Design an enzyme around this catalytic site. Structure first.
Site, short mmCIF file in Angstrom:
data_model
loop_
_atom_site.label_atom_id
_atom_site.label_comp_id
_atom_site.label_asym_id
_atom_site.label_seq_id
_atom_site.Cartn_x
_atom_site.Cartn_y
_atom_site.Cartn_z
N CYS B 109 7.01 -4.33 -0.65
CA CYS B 109 7.62 -5.65 -0.84
C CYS B 109 7.39 -6.54 0.37
O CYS B 109 7.85 -6.25 1.49
CB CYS B 109 9.14 -5.53 -1.12
N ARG B 112 10.78 -8.60 2.33
CA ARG B 112 11.84 -7.87 3.02
C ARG B 112 12.49 -8.53 4.25
O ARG B 112 13.51 -8.05 4.75
CB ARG B 112 11.30 -6.50 3.41
N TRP B 281 13.22 -14.18 -5.65
CA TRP B 281 12.47 -15.31 -6.17
C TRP B 281 10.96 -15.02 -6.06
O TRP B 281 10.55 -14.07 -5.38
CB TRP B 281 12.86 -16.58 -5.44
N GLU B 286 2.15 -14.09 -7.94
CA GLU B 286 2.67 -13.15 -8.94
C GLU B 286 2.48 -13.67 -10.35
O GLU B 286 2.14 -12.93 -11.27
CB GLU B 286 4.15 -12.86 -8.70
C1 HEM Z 1 13.54 -12.59 -2.31
C2 HEM Z 1 12.25 -12.80 -2.63
C3 HEM Z 1 11.23 -11.65 -2.86
C4 HEM Z 1 9.91 -11.83 -2.86
C5 HEM Z 1 9.18 -13.17 -2.62
C6 HEM Z 1 9.28 -10.55 -3.13
C7 HEM Z 1 7.92 -10.32 -3.20
C8 HEM Z 1 7.37 -9.18 -3.72
C9 HEM Z 1 6.04 -9.04 -4.27
C10 HEM Z 1 4.97 -10.15 -4.36
C11 HEM Z 1 5.91 -7.77 -4.67
C12 HEM Z 1 4.66 -7.20 -5.34
C13 HEM Z 1 5.03 -7.24 -6.81
C14 HEM Z 1 3.85 -7.01 -7.69
O1 HEM Z 1 2.75 -7.49 -7.32
O2 HEM Z 1 4.03 -6.37 -8.77
C15 HEM Z 1 7.14 -7.06 -4.41
C16 HEM Z 1 7.43 -5.73 -4.68
C17 HEM Z 1 8.66 -5.08 -4.60
N1 HEM Z 1 9.91 -5.65 -4.31
FE1 HEM Z 1 10.12 -7.55 -3.50
N2 HEM Z 1 10.27 -9.59 -3.28
C18 HEM Z 1 11.49 -10.24 -3.13
C19 HEM Z 1 12.74 -9.66 -3.23
C20 HEM Z 1 13.06 -8.34 -3.51
C21 HEM Z 1 14.38 -7.80 -3.76
C22 HEM Z 1 15.68 -8.65 -3.75
C23 HEM Z 1 14.25 -6.49 -4.00
C24 HEM Z 1 15.34 -5.43 -4.28
C25 HEM Z 1 16.54 -5.49 -3.69
C26 HEM Z 1 12.85 -6.16 -3.89
C27 HEM Z 1 12.28 -4.92 -4.07
C28 HEM Z 1 10.93 -4.69 -4.32
C29 HEM Z 1 10.35 -3.40 -4.62
C30 HEM Z 1 11.07 -2.04 -4.72
C31 HEM Z 1 8.85 -3.66 -4.79
C32 HEM Z 1 7.77 -2.60 -5.12
C33 HEM Z 1 7.85 -2.13 -6.57
C34 HEM Z 1 6.86 -1.01 -6.76
O3 HEM Z 1 6.89 -0.01 -5.98
O4 HEM Z 1 6.04 -1.09 -7.71
N3 HEM Z 1 12.16 -7.31 -3.60
N4 HEM Z 1 8.01 -7.96 -3.82
C1 8FD Z 2 1.68 -4.89 -13.29
N1 8FD Z 2 2.03 -4.01 -12.16
C2 8FD Z 2 3.48 -3.73 -12.15
C3 8FD Z 2 3.91 -3.27 -13.54
C4 8FD Z 2 3.81 -2.69 -11.08
C5 8FD Z 2 5.31 -2.63 -10.94
C6 8FD Z 2 6.04 -1.60 -11.52
C7 8FD Z 2 7.43 -1.55 -11.41
C8 8FD Z 2 8.07 -0.58 -11.95
N2 8FD Z 2 8.66 0.28 -12.45
C9 8FD Z 2 8.09 -2.53 -10.68
C10 8FD Z 2 7.37 -3.56 -10.08
O1 8FD Z 2 8.05 -4.51 -9.37
C11 8FD Z 2 7.41 -5.50 -8.58
C12 8FD Z 2 8.48 -6.47 -8.11
C13 8FD Z 2 9.79 -6.03 -7.93
C14 8FD Z 2 10.78 -6.91 -7.53
C15 8FD Z 2 10.46 -8.24 -7.28
C16 8FD Z 2 11.43 -9.12 -6.87
C17 8FD Z 2 12.85 -8.62 -6.71
C18 8FD Z 2 11.10 -10.45 -6.62
C19 8FD Z 2 9.77 -10.86 -6.79
N3 8FD Z 2 9.38 -12.14 -6.56
N4 8FD Z 2 8.84 -9.97 -7.21
C20 8FD Z 2 9.15 -8.68 -7.45
C21 8FD Z 2 8.16 -7.80 -7.87
C22 8FD Z 2 5.98 -3.61 -10.21
#
Ligand code: HEM
Ligand code: 8FD
Ligand code: HEM
Ligand code: 8FD
Ligand code: H4B
Ligand code: H4B
Ligand code: ZN
Lengths: 414, 411
Positions: B109, B112, B281, B286
């Site tokens: 993420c 963070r 957000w 994305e």
């Molecule tokens: C506040 C604004 C946030 C932004 C801009 C952001 C941005 C991102 C982005 C761009 C990704 C990659 C997602 C993808 O390409 O599928 C990601 C992944 C992730 N985010 Fe964040 N995020 C935010 C908040 C959060 C919050 C609030 C949480 C949980 C409390 C969180 C937990 C995660 C987790 C666990 C992943 C990885 C999921 C996986 O392993 O597939 N994020 N984030």
């Molecule tokens: C197409 N590839 C995706 C399906 C890979 C992916 C899998 C899962 C799961 N389970 C969860 C995923 O979460 C990404 C994610 C999680 C949280 C986010 C938050 C909280 C904000 C944000 N702007 N993007 C997020 C993006 C991604």
């Protein structure tokens, strides 16, 4: 454990099965509890006992490839090498072995997106070389052959192997053709900032620099452990391309050009335990290497700002993506220019599509294909290339190209 | 053994990682094989208490009361609850601490830097899908906040015997439907065609439009999941238009303001929370790169490039690259104009570099997945490209879990 590892493509759902990883030789730097896949470098001579097994592994592999494993010739060769190691503490590769080993070090280069071409590689045997002038001659013939009036052909020239480590052959240049960088007393930099250090060394060795923006550097060549020597590459052997843009008439006014032949000359080629510390190899460019990294890195020529200004872009907020916009046009210009001058070049879409095909074929015929995702995915527009969605396994096979220290850090000056 | 250096090759700044030595979960890699690009490299009371003790230990360490009276008391309390009930319940504070650090430890993420500004809604008293619906509505309404988005998580009761799981079957609280057309193409979001069919199977009446908001499908206490419609006044959406290209609005694209991932598992001190939707957000790419231009998605590059009248016969014209930038310009411009919180990949990666520096300073490291942190467009002109990162798995953490329909047995 375990014998099979599967990789998935998330765009096509194609699944491949890797067995080849079982022949992994050196460690990756990773462990079960930490991953170092984005560390750039996660890393005196070999003894006799160290060397028989390494030599045997390569010889076995070689005779396995020519479908002669366990043959009289295989067994005779093993006895020949073993005795040679026992009486001379080293051994010599046959020509066929040298060529096989060079092609396979490329084939095993997990960071190279260009590997579909690996088996067509012209290998120049320069193990009879004894002096810097001779290195210069070999290197000139390499450049002329590889360039081929724009129709580039990949090649490699291999100089004598390390013996005791006090007699190494080295190309001190990181590439055969690069542009000088000069740091100015006011802190600014003329030319390529990546090359400031090497430039300063050349100047210290007696190079008279023209102090321009695209001055081709001299070759700094070390034979047999001796102090290195300077040689000017003949200008008519250095093919270059003026960068123009197919729609922006003003782009030529930027006065950019680049060289056609990418030839990396500071890596070490390792075959069956032997170390070739001078082994320059060359291919042709992927556009992004010039247009994204060479031109648009802040630590490089850094023309994003200037281009964007001429494109009348709003440059006060980043959310306008003016950088992204400028970057595309710049890379468009690079491809256009090369294509227009009939100089071989590949765009990142074509190259990555080719690698995917190469990878699958490797899984079919070889049982795997080591690949480094962090390096394979192009530095722009990653997710719209097919490598982005492709799972990869990374591991070290041998023969291989390896990094080695810069020679000026280790050289004992005469 | 050893501290580990990571280097930024652009700025030459070197950070020293010590935090990785406290890692206890495996990465998937080995001495001989790196698996950094594999998406997923693949309890009783006896296992539970050490896991519990470890979490309690670091919690009381975080509040600077390690070895305190309350700390030891809390340990004896948890141990006694575990042999008695084969489980244990977290204090409110522990739950809040836990959730924030699962965000903090999320290697993938880029957002963070915000981790401790997290609004935690405790929904462990929930017992029904109807209650789940209500909690979720309150999450969405609070998080959306009329476009000034606020980070939240809602945590539903923990897993027990594994037969009474709470699950949000949607992968996000808000998604668009996808329909398998008669000619074999796909109307709407193709990533959701299966889930969309499941909802239709449960009696959802699909509008069969391009941007139909899916119903919530909610499973409480191991029972069959139930459908609910989110009140449309809670679903903030943005019409996508372009600052210079007037024909862009004519494309008829929209997206929703609130990204709310709802299919992951939250793990705290050995306890598993199988339903825990969290939201923040969007980073623009994305939507503009992945949701819109992925071949397995809306796949609009072709249409846009046509409207831009580009040369599309040869790939070396970088017509895909040009159209991609414009689409992402449109997305950022559209959200900004409507005052809906969004961040661009340049600003977001800058923030993450600063965040890394904070974590190395105050925590001695920061787990980070270069493969996921680097944006899917314009990689090397963002500062994270040139940033070496170390990846390791700290707990508490968010984990993947199976789609419930692969597991659930109906009645
Ligand atoms: C506040 C604004 C946030 C932004 C801009 C952001 C941005 C991102 C982005 C761009 C990704 C990659 C997602 C993808 O390409 O599928 C990601 C992944 C992730 N985010 Fe964040 N995020 C935010 C908040 C959060 C919050 C609030 C949480 C949980 C409390 C969180 C937990 C995660 C987790 C666990 C992943 C990885 C999921 C996986 O392993 O597939 N994020 N984030
Ligand atoms: C197409 N590839 C995706 C399906 C890979 C992916 C899998 C899962 C799961 N389970 C969860 C995923 O979460 C990404 C994610 C999680 C949280 C986010 C938050 C909280 C904000 C944000 N702007 N993007 C997020 C993006 C991604
Ligand atoms: C023929 C056309 C070729 C293309 C298009 C190509 C493409 C590339 C690219 C884009 C990179 C990443 C470069 C960077 O970002 O610095 C790379 C790396 C590499 N290439 Fe190739 N290459 C080609 C030929 C070759 C040949 C002929 C060899 C060896 C015989 C080779 C060996 C390598 C090695 C060893 C690396 C990684 C260097 C490292 O580990 O840092 N390549 N290639
Ligand atoms: C700014 N970062 C660079 C300095 C990283 C790098 C280091 C070394 C070394 N030593 C060697 C490297 O090789 C990359 C490479 C090697 C060979 C290539 C060939 C033969 C063709 C081509 N188009 N690109 C190449 C690219 C890269
Ligand atoms: C930190 C990061 O690992 C490093 O900058 C790498 C990332 N990927 C790369 N990929 C390529 N092709 N070339 C590079 O120089 C790099 N640099
Ligand atoms: C195979 C590869 O790991 C997979 O496609 C990853 C690559 N990097 C990614 N990075 C982000 N942010 N999101 C993703 O879905 C992916 N996909
Ligand atoms: Zn790894």
């Amino acid at each position: 454990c375990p014998r099979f590892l599967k990789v998935k493509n998330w765009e096509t759902e194609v699944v491949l099965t890797d067995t080849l990883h079982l022949k992994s030789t050196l460690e990756t730097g990773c462990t079960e509890y930490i991953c170092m896949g984005s560390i750039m470098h996660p890393s005196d001579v070999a003894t006799k006992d160290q060397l028989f097994p390494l030599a045997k592994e390569f010889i076995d592999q070689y005779y396995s490839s020519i479908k002669r494993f366990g043959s009289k010739a295989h067994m005779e060769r093993l006895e020949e090498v073993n005795k040679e190691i026992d009486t001379t503490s080293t051994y010599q590769l046959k020509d066929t072995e040298l060529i096989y080993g060079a092609k396979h070090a490329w084939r095993n280069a997990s960071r190279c997106v260009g590997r579909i071409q690996w088996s067509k590689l012209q290998v120049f045997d320069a193990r009879d070389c004894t002096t810097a002038h001779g290195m210069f001659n070999y290197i000139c013939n390499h450049v002329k052959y590889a360039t081929n009036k724009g129709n580039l052909r990949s090649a490699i020239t291999i100089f004598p192997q390390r013996t005791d480590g006090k007699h190494d052959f080295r190309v001190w240049n990181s590439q055969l053709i690069r542009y000088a960088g000069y740091k100015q007393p006011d802190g600014s930099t003329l030319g390529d900032p990546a090359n400031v250090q090497f430039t300063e060394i050349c100047i210290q060795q007696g190079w008279k620099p023209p102090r321009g923006r695209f001055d081709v550097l001299p070759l700094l060549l070390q034979a047999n452990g001796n102090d290195p020597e300077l040689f000017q590459i003949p200008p008519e052997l250095v093919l270059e391309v003026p960068i123009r843009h197919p729609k922006f008439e003003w782009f030529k006014d930027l006065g950019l050009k680049w060289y056609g032949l990418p030839a990396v000359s500071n890596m070490l080629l390792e075959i069956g335990g032997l170390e070739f510390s001078a082994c320059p190899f060359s291919g042709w460019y992927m556009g992004t290497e010039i247009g994204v990294r060479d031109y648009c890195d802040n630590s490089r020529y850094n023309i994003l700002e200037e281009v964007a200004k001429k494109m009348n872009l709003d440059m006060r907020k980043t959310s306008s993506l003016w950088k992204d916009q400028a970057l595309v046009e710049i890379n468009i210009a690079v491809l256009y220019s090369f294509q227009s001058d009939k100089v071989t070049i590949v765009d990142h879409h074509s190259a990555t599509e080719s690698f995917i095909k190469h990878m699958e074929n490797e899984y079919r015929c070889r049982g795997g294909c080591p690949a480094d995702w962090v390096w394979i995915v192009p530095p722009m527009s990653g997710s719209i290339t097919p490598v982005f969605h492709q799972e990869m396994l990374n591991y070290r096979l041998t023969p291989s190209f390896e990094y080695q220290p810069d020679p000026w850090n280790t050289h004992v000056w005469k």
